[PDB]
Design a protein around this ligand. Structure first.
Ligand SMILES: Nc1ncnc2c1ncn2[C@@H]1O[C@H](COP(=O)(O)OP(=O)(O)NP(=O)(O)O)[C@@H](O)[C@H]1O
Ligand SMILES: [Mg+2]
Lengths: 1068, 49, 98, 99, 49
């Protein structure tokens, strides 16, 4: 099949579809329906002729004959079940195969309509995974409809979760008041080149199309030339992508060059430079050679395609000479540009001291390892077997080669380095013969950096070095996934999740000791592994597992790379938003897809978007929690900032203090947060260009509002996940007992998509939450009406004014709207009749020191007039006082107006209601943000009630155990004294009193002070105290409407003690 | 961060370093007669210069 | 700026100071732990009465001052007894204290 | 030492050792700290290394060490003799940056 | 420095040790530049093995 992984698993779908499509290619099937089933199967329906049902030459029906021979037989072989529905010869049939066993074909209803349907379930006992990639499937079927001008392909995915974004074009707005795609391209290859040159943006407008009927073949070619920098000439021989080449490619190239020379007489890589074309040949008896099963052999096809291209090509230039003119003014431009490119004393030249080459002279026995400098630079260079292994550590940044010109590509040092190491050239100068290492091992981290680099290199090798992949010289290091660390024994390395449990159980069962929290090491970086470990696990040929990067469809891989690495932001955005809930031969298009999504999402969740539940990005969440867990509560005195930064850095976020302290500060700044989460002490900067004081100087502790953010986190109210060094547990979200997202707002741009939520009033927000809590069963349309009205708009900390309410109502109803903001200016005359405008309030996010300067430089260059001075008279005691001296000739009213015009005194806030809903980026409406928060709060309460019940029935067990010992104290004490060891004393307790090993240990570990009369009564009363609590939480669980109420009251309490009066005035 | 007062007799100039107490000296001050000059860069040694 | 001998002697001198500073502290701690063990051992002899006393007093402070009335000891020694976990009263563990 | 990273016990990430120093002893940028940590881990730097590292700790060339989140480091049998009985009032102590 | 040979016949000097604190990669570089500049003649090649 090719692979037990995802590569081979998909090949089953092609082996099924290819028969159904090459039936449509015969001209009998109009539509093919492809359904990815919820369970694990695949349904491939069609309106063809029907699979031969009657008895074959052997004696057994032809359906069974085709399913256990040469092909489609392998699908049934690797299927737990394969059902085959045939509609032919005036009747329809059953024929089911149970674990490849042909059971029986039952003839039911008489169908006068023709077609077929194959439903097959893949075997998980054979394959690693039984999950098909929709995008991979989607891409390969799309081209299937391009190749056949009159066929419909309908792909649908059943296992689509209740919420998840399904759409191709993911709407930049609202989104509110089964993944399906249809393919039909009446243009054929013409429609295909339109699709190709969509972004490339073609020179001429006339797509070249011609068909060539053959004596035993049939060719079809579509062309267009672009502004672009590379050849997008995809070839096909009987619906198969001949990426390697073949006679049809070399015949078209001969005849194309021998055509461009005839029109040069009027007025190679050189010509082809622009071109985006599609050769579609049909061969009766086609036989392909190549290193891959690709590359059409058939020598008569060269002579046929060269004859077809000769006549039909000249003809286009003759009939369309106006476009033919702009074609040559690109081709000759390509010549002289790459001519000028062509063009040292006693030089080694061989990469000075930026590489460490192997002793081996022979490339056959030589291996090159491309690592990241800070990743495995030192460890690879040292761990290696120098006799045959070379290490090229990339000490620098890799360009996104995808859209760039070969000029900037070859300039970039890290690209330039790679070419120098392998020895082979570039595009034209490229000669695979010159290859200096017969294996290129790319080694990089699982971390957001390593994945980002993989994408970059797989983009480069796919574009500037395609032969290296096809010939199978490009690999991927498969480093250990886990390090099972035993206490007395040496560690064992697992590569798989399944392999870990294997070594874990067997090892424990054999009598080994491991920690049952931090005992397993999930690797993220190659920097983790020791030199010795690196050779023993991922470098030594005698033990290692490599991954051969194979191209399986170049035309589909052209698409994937043109989306994720290209310039189309809205296509890329959409893909990310769709695919958000996420030795050995490996597919490039699947490694490139996984590496991109993983990087895309890490940079989205990490820095771009807040959670809907608690409104924070991970850094803030990690500052707040480290602070909480460090005990810097408002009751206790402040702790030096450094302490909190250190606690976050060491346990949750192990990246330089830089960003950690930078967030700590923002949460402390009252001009930054409407509701500050941190209570700072000292210099925390200004809303101007004044920075905060060092972390060693300033002090901070949580605010009582941030205490409500954390409230009962320790009571299992949120899902915790292991921290970077799997030593502790970090929360996935904070309880958020007040609605943080809306209360404080959120900004952030990363990987194409950005959020910009404004801050609001807590009092107005509580109103809308109480409405949602109360009116729990109400429509999206009604609840949206109710939230607006309760919530009267954003409430910026810096106050100011909100001019009008359209952009406000816009962002509530859609999730995108522009909110105009204005500043408060007061007028005060002097003593000498010199009037002066004094800015008292400025809009949110306007920098103070950057504002004064703007005016100063605007006055300096004449753009602003009637202003003689600017002074900053602002202090904590007199608020904001930006004093603008206006001339005695100048009218204060018009100056106030001209400042509203040009300067920051008036600026519109662009709202974007983006937030991570169930790990999926989503644009939301005010009600959705409300109802998702209520959702959270109601979960938090039951979870809290659950833990409380558990942690009480736990304590009561102990207390009942202790009480039992207090009445039996004489016996209990005379027993312990007589017993020689503690375990002998413990055994005697379980005898004496019918107790547990835990109730008895409670007795033993009990201090003597606890025996004094008052303390015995403390234990007596505590038991009846706890027993009263248990009774209550049993009721709380039992009554869901009682939990709905707890939420209401617990939140009213928060707004009754922390709610505040509206800062900014909404005007019209 | 200039003061209101025009008269130098009653005026006062506080020279800080933004990094240390710029932001805060700016807040604490009686803006009526107190001005803040937060030093936001590297000062030279004017000795043998 | 030092010769080789200056460095060797300044080192040796610090080692000689490190030893005395240690021995002094070790001794200081050895007498601290000793008076405690003296406290507990005294309490192990009167154990019957000791237990009888603690439960006969309502609060821990009546029991503490009662643990100085009973055994002629100090508040640090009397707090050592009260904080004694019941486990430490099994034969082997009582012998560890003596 | 205070954090209990003895050579008996397993390796702790560099970031834990860095965060502790920065935390209550030397509140500066992690680079200055981790760079010192890394030096004591390099056998071509210290004749008698004081840090028992694990992972990419650079090279005697222009190869940098890995991030503090990746490399693991603990004290050495010799560095233990450097800290031998510090708890026993063998040296003078002074109050830290915050006191 | 050790002087290996008799491979293809061509001789070479293998640096087995370097003095304390010399940066290996900046040394290989140093030699290579001197060679490029003609300042160091006789050296036909350098490499870290
Ligand atoms: N919808 C269909 N209607 C009629 N016959 C069909 C249909 N689909 C498949 N078949 C037949 O099933 C046979 C078995 O498939 P298979 O073993 O793959 O042979 P193949 O199609 O000739 N070769 P391959 O290129 O490997 O797919 C084919 O040869 C077809 O004749
Ligand atoms: Mg087939």
């Amino acid at each position: 099949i090719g692979s037990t992984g995802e590569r081979g698993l998909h090949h089953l779908i092609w082996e099924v579809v290819d028969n159904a499509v090459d039936e449509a290619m015969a001209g009998y099937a109009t539509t093919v329906n492809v359904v990815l089933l919820e369970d694990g199967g695949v349904e491939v329906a069609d309106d063809g002729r029907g699979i031969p049902v009657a008895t074959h030459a052997s004696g057994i029906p032809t359906v069974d004959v085709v399913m256990t021979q040469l092909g489609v037989s392998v699908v049934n072989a690797l299927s737990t079940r394969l059902e085959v529905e045939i509609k032919r010869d005036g009747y329809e049939w059953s024929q089911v195969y149970e674990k490849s066993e042909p059971l029986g074909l039952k003839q039911g209803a008489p169908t006068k309509k023709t077609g077929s349907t194959v439903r097959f379930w893949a075997d998980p006992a054979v394959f690693e995974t039984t999950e098909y990639d929709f995008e991979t499937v989607a891409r390969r079927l799309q081209e299937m409809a391009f190749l056949n001008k009159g066929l419909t392909i309908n792909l649908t995915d059943e296992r689509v979760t209740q919420d998840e974004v399904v759409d191709e074009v993911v709407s930049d707005v609202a989104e509110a008041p089964v993944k399906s795609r249809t393919f039909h391209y009446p243009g054929g290859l013409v429609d295909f080149v339109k699709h190709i040159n969509r972004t490339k943006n073609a020179i001429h407008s006339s797509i070249v199309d011609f068909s060539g009927k053959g004596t035993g073949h049939e060719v079809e070619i579509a062309m267009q030339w672009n502004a672009g920098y590379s050849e997008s000439v995809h070839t096909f021989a009987n619906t198969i992508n001949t990426h390697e080449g073949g006679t049809h490619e070399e015949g078209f190239r001969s005849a194309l060059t021998s055509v461009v020379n005839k029109y040069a007489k009027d007025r190679g890589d050189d010509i082809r430079e622009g071109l985006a074309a599609v050769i579609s040949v049909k061969v009766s008896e086609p036989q392909f050679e190549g290193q891959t099963k690709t590359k059409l052999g058939n020598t008569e096809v060269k002579s046929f395609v060269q004859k077809v291209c000769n006549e039909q090509l000249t003809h286009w230039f003759e009939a369309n000479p106006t476009d033919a003119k702009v074609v040559v003014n690109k081709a000759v431009s390509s010549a002289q540009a790459r001519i000028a490119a062509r063009k040292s004393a006693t030089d080694i030249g061989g990469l000075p001291g930026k590489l460490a080459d192997c002793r081996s002279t022979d490339p056959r026995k030589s291996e090159l390892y491309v690592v990241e400098g800070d990743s495995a630079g030192g460890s690879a260079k040292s761990g290696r077997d120098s006799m045959f292994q070379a290490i090229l550590p990339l000490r620098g940044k890799i360009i996104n080669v995808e859209k760039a010109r070969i000029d900037r590509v070859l300039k970039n040092t890290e690209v330039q380095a790679i070419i120098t190491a392998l020895g082979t050239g570039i595009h034209d100068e490229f000669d695979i013969g010159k290859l200096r290492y017969h294996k290129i091992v790319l080694m990089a981290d699982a971390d957001v950096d390593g994945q980002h680099i993989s994408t970059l290199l797989l983009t480069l090798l796919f574009r500037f070095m395609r032969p290296l992949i096809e010939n199978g010289h490009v690999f991927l290091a498969q480093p250990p996934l886990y390090k099972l660390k035993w206490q007395r024994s040496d560690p064992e390395f697992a590569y798989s999740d399944r392999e870990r449990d294997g070594l874990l159980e067997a090892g424990l069962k054999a009598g080994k000791k491991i920690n049952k929290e931090d005992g397993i090491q999930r690797y993220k970086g190659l920097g983790e592994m020791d030199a010795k470990e690196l050779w023993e696990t991922t470098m030594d040929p005698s033990v290692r597992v490599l991954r051969q990067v194979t191209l399986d469809d170049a035309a589909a891989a052209d698409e994937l790379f043109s989306i994720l690495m290209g310039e189309d932001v809205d296509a890329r955005r959409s893909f990310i938003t769709r695919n958000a809930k996420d030795i050995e031969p490996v597919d490039i298009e699947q490694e490139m897809q996984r590496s991109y999504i993983d990087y895309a999402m890490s940079v989205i969740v990490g820095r771009a978007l807040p959670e809907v539940r608690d409104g924070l990005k991970p850094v803030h969440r990690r500052v707040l929690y480290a602070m909480f867990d460090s005990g810097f509560r408002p009751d206790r005195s402040h702790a030096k900032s450094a302490r909190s930064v250190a606690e976050t850095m060491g346990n949750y976020h192990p990246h330089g203090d830089a960003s950690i302290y930078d967030s700590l500060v923002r949460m402390a700044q009252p001009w930054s947060l409407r509701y500050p989460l941190v209570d700072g002490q000292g210099n925390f900067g200004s809303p101007g260009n004044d920075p905060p004081a060092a972390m060693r100087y300033t002090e901070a502790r949580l605010t009582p509002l941030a205490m409500e953010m954390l409230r009962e986190i320790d009571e299992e109210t949120v899902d915790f996940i292991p921290n970077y060094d799997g030593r502790v547990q970090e929360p996935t979200v904070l309880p958020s007992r007040f609605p943080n997202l809306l209360a404080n707002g959120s900004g952030g741009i990363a990987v194409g998509m950005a959020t910009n939520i404004p801050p609001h009033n807590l009092r107005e927000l509580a109103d809308a939450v109480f409405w949602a809590l109360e009116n729990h069963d109400a429509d999206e349309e009604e609840t949206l009406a109710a939230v607006m009205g309760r919530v009267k708009g954003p409430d910026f900390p810096t106050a100011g004014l909100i001019v009008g309410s359209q952009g406000t109502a816009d962002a509530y109803k859609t999730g995108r709207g522009s909110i105009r903001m204005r500043g408060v200016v007061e007028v005060e005359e002097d003593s000498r009749g010199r009037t002066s405008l004094v800015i008292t309030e400025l809009p949110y996010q306007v920098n103070h020191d950057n504002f004064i300067t703007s005016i100063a430089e605007q006055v300096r260059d004449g753009k602003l007039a009637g202003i003689s001075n600017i002074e900053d008279q602002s202090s904590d005691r007199v608020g904001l006082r930006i004093v603008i001296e206006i001339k005695r000739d100048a009218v204060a009213k018009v100056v106030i107006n001209n400042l509203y015009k040009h300067t920051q005194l008036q600026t519109s806030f662009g709202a974007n209601m983006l937030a991570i809903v169930d790990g999926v980026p989503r644009t939301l409406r005010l009600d959705q943000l409300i109802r998702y928060y209520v959702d959270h709060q109601l979960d938090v309460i039951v979870r809290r009630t659950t833990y409380r019940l558990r942690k009480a029935n736990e304590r009561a067990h102990i207390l009942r155990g202790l009480v039992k010992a207090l009445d039996a104290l004489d016996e209990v004490i005379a027993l312990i004294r007589a017993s020689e060891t503690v375990d002998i004393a413990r055994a005697g307790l379980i005898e004496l009193l019918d107790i547990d090993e835990i109730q008895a240990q409670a007795i033993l570990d009990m201090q003597l002070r606890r025996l004094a009369a008052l303390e015995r009564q403390r234990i007596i009363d505590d038991l009846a105290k706890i027993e009263a609590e248990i009774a209550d939480l049993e009721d709380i669980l039992a009554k869901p409407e009682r939990q709905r109420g707890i939420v209401r009251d617990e939140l009213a309490e928060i707004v009754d003690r922390h709610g505040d009066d509206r800062r900014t005035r909404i005007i019209a």
